[PDB]
């Protein structure tokens, strides 16, 4: 007979995740300010990491944290983000004190807990952006043309964040990021 697993084995997650950190410098290629921190594939290892890092709210504005599935870099150019998009959560100044941190953690839980049923396979990662003009949080998916999976994720996510239901959020494809001048950024889906 062997020993009992629940007693000593760690709680494995669906996928192994990687945490990346961005530091602005506005004097270096965007890619060069992007650095990997570490990875993990268990609930315990997740908390070990989370517990020893600054709360997004305490970071110097201009930085971002990013949690994506191992193998998927947190950038548009990636094979898995190229055709994708993101559900964006735009916060106001005040919300940096009341919601940023909790919102970001809930995002993290949705990611590692695979809280979107089979549609959690279309998820690439999430990223938090600390900015003085207003913070932002977003969940990236691989195919912005996959409305069924995209609308499902948006709903659950918005519901998991618990923000007032009357507040609508939009989903935008990375490929349409304005490139002209403002050119007006828009949404493929809304919930």
């Amino acid at each position: 007979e062997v020993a009992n697993p629940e007693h000593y084995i760690k709680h494995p997650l669906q996928n192994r995740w990687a945490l990346w950190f961005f530091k602005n410098d506005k004097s270096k290629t965007w890619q060069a300010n992007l650095r990997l921190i570490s990875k993990f594939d268990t609930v315990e290892d997740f908390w070990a990491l989370y517990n020893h890092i600054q709360l997004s709210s305490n970071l110097m504005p201009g930085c971002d944290y990013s949690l994506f599935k191992d193998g998927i870099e947190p950038m548009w150019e990636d094979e898995k983000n190229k055709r994708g998009g993101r559900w964006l959560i735009t916060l106001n100044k005040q919300q940096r004190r009341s919601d940023l941190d909790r919102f970001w953690l809930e995002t993290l839980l949705c990611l590692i807990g695979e809280s979107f049923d089979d549609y959690s396979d279309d998820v690439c990662g999430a990223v938090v952006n600390v900015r003085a003009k207003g913070d932002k949080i977003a969940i990236w998916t691989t195919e912005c043309e996959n409305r069924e999976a995209v609308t499902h994720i948006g709903r659950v996510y918005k519901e998991r964040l618990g923000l007032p239901p009357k507040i609508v959020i939009g989903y935008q494809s990375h490929a349409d990021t304005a490139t002209k001048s403002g050119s007006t950024t828009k949404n493929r889906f809304v919930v």
Partner: peptide, 20 residues
């Protein structure tokens, strides 16, 4: 179809303690 695989709910993850 697809495979089941690991799905954790809020409570459980939080239950595993850490940052409340």
């Amino acid at each position: 179809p697809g495979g089941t695989r690991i799905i954790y709910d809020r409570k459980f993850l939080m239950e595993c303690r850490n940052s409340p």
